[PDB]
């Protein structure tokens, strides 16, 4: 029944302020210490600091001291992680965790689901969708390029075509914009019968593209 619920994904620009939240339920919030842990892509986990919700007492990793503030609001069972001025180096997944410290214990038993923070100067941009035309199994696809921020959703024939689909993770180009490909392998002889359409949705820009992929 014990849970920690974190606020949604954040997309911010360098120098912007941000406050993210961690709400406890199923236990007495005031009695257990809440800690913040960050995880960067490829890299592991780093400890950031701790709040004692009962006192407002805090401690910070010297690495983040002066860059972040941890606070809590006892009355609403919520802990916060706040930045006055975000940096590119703040792009990460952030977790809040409940600390168990009785006797010899010193561990994190309950974790929040995570909050992603993306720091970029890029502005919302919808993707350009290009076909990857097929030349006994044929491969065909769609190139979903130059969009920001993540995510984009890609389906085939309004989701009805799932078997053999691979929608690759997005790659962040040097432009600051993302790009990905979604491919599907189909019976060779279906190319002259079945219509193949990739359905691309990018909610931030309200892009809804239905790109027909024709053999060529």
């Amino acid at each position: 029944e014990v849970q920690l619920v974190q606020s949604g994904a954040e997309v911010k620009k360098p120098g912007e302020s941000l406050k993210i939240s961690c709400k406890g339920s199923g236990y007495a919030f005031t009695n257990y210490l809440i800690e913040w842990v960050r995880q960067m892509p490829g890299k592991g986990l780093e400890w950031m600091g701790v709040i004692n919700p009962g006192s407002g007492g805090t401690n910070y990793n010297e690495k983040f001291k002066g860059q972040v503030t941890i606070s809590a609001d006892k009355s609403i069972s919520t802990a916060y992680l706040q930045w006055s001025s975000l940096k590119a180096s703040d792009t990460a997944m952030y977790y809040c965790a409940r600390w168990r410290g009785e006797g010899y214990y010193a561990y994190f038993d309950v974790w929040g689901q995570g909050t992603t923070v993306t720091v970029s100067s890029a502005s919302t941009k919808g993707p350009s969708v290009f076909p990857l035309a097929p030349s006994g199994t044929a491969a065909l696809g769609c190139l979903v390029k130059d969009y920001f921020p993540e995510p984009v959703t890609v389906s085939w024939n309004s989701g009805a075509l799932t078997s053999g689909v691979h929608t690759f993770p997005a790659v962040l180009q040097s432009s600051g914009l993302y790009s990905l490909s979604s491919v599907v392998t189909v019976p060779s002889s279906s190319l002259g019968t079945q219509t193949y359409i990739c359905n691309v949705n990018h909610k931030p820009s309200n892009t809804k593209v239905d790109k027909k992929v024709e053999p060529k």
């Binding site: 986990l45 400890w47 990857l132």
Partner: protein, 346 residues
């Protein structure tokens, strides 16, 4: 404290025994030998205070170290001036000594750099007396004994055997870490009995007796001995399968894209194992560098294969300067590097 995990990644089969290691840069163990019993220590102080004594508290609260230190300064202050001239003035001096020794023993018990709990014990707030110059002011100490016991429960230690301040977590893609083992060897409630941990000082280990489908994930070790808490780099347990060569496909840029002044050329490596694959772009047999990006899927849930896309990006002009576009694929499953080509003019 730096935590090193080995291996960083490895392939294993279901039904296999798995042992992953964690090496600490310095010992994560504390305690042992000759104790911190919050019940006994507090019960003794409470008895003495009732023998010696609305409290006027100060506006500014204090940490546990500042709180204990103030009551020691108070105890030493009375002793310095109290001249025994009767049986009652000798008994109060002796009780003042018993209180001073009990406060000093709680203080030295928690206030030292080694104590892994010190910084977290210091987040707690204690109420201070506005004035502490007479025996009556001990009522201020008595009222703050219950929060004192709650803080001492964090540094509770009974027994000569040492404790290892080291934990193991399991993390699956996109999901939060999940505690498996705490304090080197204790299995978390609900964790299958196939998981175990052992170790001491700097060397720790995590064992899975017979690997199951749900066990493929990344495992992290974590130390709790010194601030800041640190984690190991993780060990990713990958599913082993038979070698599978990729099905390679090449895609020329669309006319739509070319019309806009850019040419993205895509090479696809489909359903291969192991993950290790080298993709090289050749344009008229000349090796391309720094104009390509790769992306790889996670291991397939049923097939246990990977797929990879490689994208070569060129301007329309650079693209039209050449004829043959090739992607040369090197993989364990392939006896020789497989090339997939096209000529710019269909």
């Amino acid at each position: 404290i730096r935590l090193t995990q080995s291996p960083s990644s490895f392939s294993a089969s279901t039904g296999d025994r798995v042992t992953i290691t964690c090496k600490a840069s310095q010992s994560v163990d504390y305690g042992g030998g000759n104790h911190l019993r919050p019940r006994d220590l507090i019960s003794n102080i409470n008895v003495i205070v009732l023998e010696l004594k609305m409290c006027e508290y100060a506006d500014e609260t204090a940490t546990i170290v500042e709180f204990l230190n103030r009551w020691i300064t108070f105890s030493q202050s009375i002793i310095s001036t109290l001249t025994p001239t009767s049986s009652s003035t000798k008994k109060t001096q002796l009780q003042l000594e018993h209180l001073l020794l009990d406060l000093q023993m709680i203080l030295n018990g928690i206030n030292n750099y080694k104590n892994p709990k010190l910084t977290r014990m210091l987040t707690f707030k204690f109420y201070m007396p506005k004035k502490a110059t007479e025996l009556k002011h001990l009522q201020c100490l008595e009222e703050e004994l219950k929060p004192l016991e709650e803080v001492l429960n964090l540094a509770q230690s009974k027994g000569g055997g040492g404790d290892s301040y080291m934990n193991w977590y399991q993390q699956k893609p996109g999901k939060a870490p999940k505690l498996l083992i705490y304090a080197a060897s204790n299995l978390e409630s609900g964790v299958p009995s196939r998981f175990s941990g052992s170790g001491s000082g700097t060397d720790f280990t995590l064992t899975i007796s017979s690997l199951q489908s749900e066990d493929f994930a990344t495992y992290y070790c974590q130390q709790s001995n010194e601030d800041p808490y640190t984690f190991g780099g993780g060990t990713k347990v990958e599913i082993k399968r038979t070698v599978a060569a990729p099905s390679v496909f090449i895609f020329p840029p669309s006319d739509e894209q070319l019309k806009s002044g850019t040419a993205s050329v895509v090479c696809l490596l489909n359903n291969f194992y192991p993950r290790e694959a080298k993709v090289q772009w050749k344009v008229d047999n000349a090796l391309q560098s720094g104009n390509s990006q790769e992306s790889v899927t996670e291991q397939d849930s049923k097939d246990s294969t990977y797929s990879l896309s490689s994208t070569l990006t060129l301007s329309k002009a650079d693209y039209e300067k050449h004829k043959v576009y090739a992607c040369e694929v090197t993989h364990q499953g392939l006896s020789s590097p497989v090339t997939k080509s096209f000529n710019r003019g269909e």
